[PDB]
Amino acid sequence: ATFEIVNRCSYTVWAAASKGDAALDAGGRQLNSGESWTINVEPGTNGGKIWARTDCYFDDSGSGICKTGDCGGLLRCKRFGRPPTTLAEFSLNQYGKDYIDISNIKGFNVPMDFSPTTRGCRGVRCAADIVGQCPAKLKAPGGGCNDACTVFQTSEYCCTTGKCGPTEYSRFFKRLCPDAFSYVLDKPTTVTCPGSSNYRVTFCPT
């Protein structure tokens, strides 16, 4: 499966792609404003994520830091990113279909559209100004809008028991972005696509 990753932001981002225990494709690349990067993701990939990182510095070797979504200081992510991170999430070729969503469960850093480039399902989008409207207690000094689990580390925000309800904080995310997961047990906003669909992730789509 191909994913075209497109940075429409006025600022540089460092795209990242991982399934948590490994890179997808090269795992990360710089995208200047306007640039497109196409990756190939193995069929059957389960629990993959794509995200943007902001304000990154890398050396020679591909090692450094980012202020949002840093993945163990690698340019080329092999692991998931440090919140806050708006997340494009996908599982491919799961009993005949693909499943995509956007999640704010790990907070929000960059607005995003995640859409098929092939037939037979809708895209999803979270492109509201969550960072600008972020509740004060969730603002990350580093940049972005943290989720409540990240900030407060409670069973209720993190849904540790698998028992949790929506919260004042999750409802903020949901209000701004109805079509993205706002907490672990949110009413799913997952879209079913044909197996082996292809996709475009667009940062700052509007």
Decide: is 119 part of the binding site for K ion (CB under 5 A): yes
Q: Residues in contact with K ion, total (CB under 5 A)?
A: 8
Beta-bridged to residue 114, according to DSSP, are: 124, 201
Angle at the Cα of 186 from the Cα atoms of 183 and 189, rounded to 5 degrees: 115
For 146, residues 6+ apart whose C-beta sits below 8 A from its C-beta are 83, 84, 107, 138, 139, 140
**Two structure tokens written together for 77:** 């992510």
- In this chain, which stretch among 42-50, 136-144, 153-161, 186-194 interacts with K ion, using CB under 5 A? 186-194
Burial of residue 132, with CB atoms counted within 10 A of its CB: 0-12 exposed, 13-18 middle, 19 or more buried: exposed
Closer residue to K ion in complex, CB, 107/123: 123
State the residue number with the nearest CB to K ion: 123
Q: Give the residue, chosen from 48, 69, 123, 144, that forms a contact with K ion under the rule CB under 5 A.
A: 123
Closer residue to K ion in complex, CB, 46/63: 46
Please check whether residue 28 is in contact with residue 17, taking contact to mean a CB–CB distance below 8 angstroms.
yes
- In this chain, which stretch among 5-13, 48-56, 70-78, 114-122 interacts with K ion, using CB under 5 A? 114-122
Decide: is 206 part of the binding site for K ion (CB under 5 A): no
Which residues are at the interface with K ion (CB under 5 A)?
119-120, 123, 125, 171, 174-175, 188
